[PDB]
Structure 1
């Protein structure tokens, strides 16, 4: 502030210090300095959680910021109850034994060996340090193949009336397998409203609903992006896998196999066979012999 010089402001703070109680100005170092924190214990800690309730592998709880103002990261931690890891936003301390360690793989966070690709975690911009996550975030190209959703770097999809049924989604260029395609973005909505609205769509046969997790659903009728018009196939060239990034579950889409220019996109809805003929009974491919 240029209105006042430091003198009579320093003196004002002298008056302020005499009026307002002095600030604490306390510094801490924590009893731990280094070591005693091997990431195998984290995996062991993860193993403990995995065998407790993650063995079911069906109850996907969305992340919630847990508050631990004084209590440590005990078994009462909401993420522990929600069979989930704490995040950087969690009120758990910087020593919280649940947070993801990182994505330190040297080549790029994209393959089976890397903890990011095996786990739900899309590699954090601040964690997958070797795969250039934080580096040149403006630059579209990067070593990693598990941060495109972080960057939002989609493909250039095309809209044209699908030969199978109505509208579909085409691609202008070849694309390889096991790599990022445009994300099925949409609207966050709970199960109860999803069935009520779905009941309307079920009456109208529309199914722009997607089972995000057991706790929330994403619907694409009113609001969405282009890929919502992708048609279903039982053996499609492209698949769908929920990913988990930056504290928000999303659903990434990736091609199963190598693709060339102009191929129409399909992915499995993962509905019941009765519902399959009820909704997607068209496949358009016989047996050759």
Structure 2
């Protein structure tokens, strides 16, 4: 698998060095050619997925998820991978083990079943409506994915200026090519609010070739807490949009 990492040196030494150019997955299908330099996923700078038609010999296939304690923490390279630990791969962490059940050592196993929490609806301390958690959770733990419609940049740009005219943003930057809409359809977390130092944060996900976005806890959480995250706007934007910070001057 080090040669795939050696390929990955080529994958990084020319195309992934920016570490921001992220594109929609496509099936790198090679009717006669091998997984060449012009391979569709190579030019897309990602694996030859099993859904693609780069055959099994392809070194650009992701090796596997071999974390025998759990796929959930730094040494797990699949945990460093943007993707949920594939059921076919993390036999070492119970990825496919009792996919109907809800107990396993791994934590990168949420979207594959929907291990969702129990949200709350109410006004928020900071602005209007709000979302709250029911039960205590620990740092670096999953919170339900930011589900929503998927739209293009320009329409959103067309929508955003209208949205911002009424000061609306149900939009998360999906990738360099697309953006997730959550205006009419939406998740249950869509009605939470913002902090500069929140108790939880969002991690960019690659759910089986789908660019997705969940939430993870920055610190300890017990019952009856607010739920915020850093929207990561411009500073002029932040004051314009999320100026309220809910703090006083201690020193």
Name the TM-score, length of structure 2 as normaliser. 0.98
State the 1:53 CA deviation.
1.3
Alpha-carbon distance in 2 for matches of 1:174, 1:229: 20
Q: 1:181-201: per-residue Cα shift (whole Å, max 9, x none)?
A: 011000010001111111111
Max Rg structure: 1
Question: Structure 2 stretches of 5 or more lacking a match?
Answer: none
1:266-281 map, 5 Å: 266-281=228-243
Matching residue within 55, 58, 61 for 1:99: 61
Structure 1 unaligned segments of length 5 or more: list them: 1-38
Give how far 1:157 is off.
1.1
Indicate conservation of the 8 Å contact 1:124/1:245, yes or no. no
**Alignment partners' CA distance in 2, 1:156 and 1:47:** 43
Whether the 8 Å CA contact 1:186–1:223 is kept in 2: the answer is yes
Quote the RMSD (CA, aligned, Å).
0.9
How far off is 1:288 after superposition?
Answer: 2.5
**What residue number does 2:124 align with?**
162
SS at match of 2:204: strand
- Displacement of 1:230: 1.4
Is contact 1:122–1:245 with CA below 8 Å preserved after alignment?
yes
Aligned residue for 2:193, secondary structure, equals coil
State the distance in 1 between where 2:32 and 2:249 align: 65
Show CA shifts across 1:51-80 (max 9, x none): 111110111112111111221111110111
Corresponding residue pairs, total: 251
Shift of 1:216: 0.8
TM-score, structure 1 normalization: 0.85
SS in structure 2 of the partner of residue 192 of structure 1: helix
2:145 aligned with 1:194? no
